[PDB]
């Protein structure tokens, strides 16, 4: 597990090679989600991103598929695209086909581990969230049971 990281296309920041298939596995600790944001996108554009693409894949699901050349028009933020998953595992797959004649320079993305708010998103009386988990608390009369979930009088 890891709290943060970076994913760059092959040969970044220069042009990526052709006929290339690369994969990255993102893992953060339990109790954490993943926020993955792209700060650079320069990829050959095609319909449905069927030639060159970046696939963001969750468990047996496709979170996203990116191609083309985009950048932020916000002066206060360099983020082009972003994904926020409530899981501790993610996959990034970069695919490049036969020809890169136009010399596209690929992508640059970063991910960080976010905290799951288990109380907003589990306790009989009071849920207190903390970074990486939660605990349950009770009014001054009740006591916590052995399951650490339910409270009752003595």
């Amino acid at each position, epitope marked *: 597990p890891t709290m943060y990281g970076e994913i760059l296309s092959p040969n970044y920041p220069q042009a990526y090679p052709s006929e290339v298939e690369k994969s990255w596995d993102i893992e953060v600790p339990e109790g954490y989600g993943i926020h993955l944001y792209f700060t650079h996108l320069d990829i050959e554009l095609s319909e449905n991103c069927a030639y060159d693409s970046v696939q963001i894949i969750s468990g047996d699901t496709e979170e996203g598929r990116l191609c083309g050349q*985009r*950048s*932020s*028009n*916000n*002066p*206060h933020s360099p*983020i*082009v*695209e972003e994904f926020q998953v409530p899981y501790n595992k993610l996959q990034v797959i970069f695919k490049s086909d036969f020809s890169n004649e136009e010399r596209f320079t690929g992508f640059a993305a970063y991910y960080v581990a976010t905290d799951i708010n288990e109380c907003t998103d589990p306790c009989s009386h009071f849920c207190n969230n903390f970074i990486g988990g939660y605990f349950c608390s009770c009014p001054p009369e009740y006591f916590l049971h052995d399951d650490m979930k339910n409270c009752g009088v003595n």
Partner: antibody
Amino acid sequence: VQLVESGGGVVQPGRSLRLSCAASGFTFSAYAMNWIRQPPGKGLEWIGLIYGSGHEFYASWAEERVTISVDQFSLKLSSVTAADTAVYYCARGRSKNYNSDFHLWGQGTLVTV
Amino acid sequence: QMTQSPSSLSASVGDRVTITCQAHEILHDKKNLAWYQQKPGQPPKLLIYSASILESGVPSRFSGSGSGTDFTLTISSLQPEDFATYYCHGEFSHGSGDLNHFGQGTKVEI
């Protein structure tokens, strides 16, 4: 996804103009959000935007007279003149930090002065 | 910022329509130009974005093209439902005027 606006009516000149818009099926914090207006018989005129991160930008003719807020998506226009009567639209951009197009529009509230 | 030509155009059903837009600056990402179609009493409908990409559900007669400053919308075959007003919309990089600007419009009549 859907956008619905409200607040359209008759307003005396010099008074205040406030319009509101509610989304349906998406959150306002993930897309760049725009106010546009169209005078009767005239063309479309971009008023302003707020990006998903939360930064508000305005047109040159409205940088001193307009405040755009997110909560909801509200537009506030002061010193309302007989030139401010128009159908006001709310629109959504393609991404968070750029527009590139408006694919999801509202319905448009007519405001008379 | 945006100059759309012509202001109006009259053509019969089945002819080709050309509408030009000039930005006088470089668009954001060099290609952030959208084309919309509006009918009376209705909001505008996005036809084209990124200066060439047709939106889902748009007939194939509509076409887009253009370089950094000059852009063109083409209707290869007019239809009874193609008579409306058309707008170009440009996104511009921060620090060069307004972020977004619409063209004057072009009303098409039989």
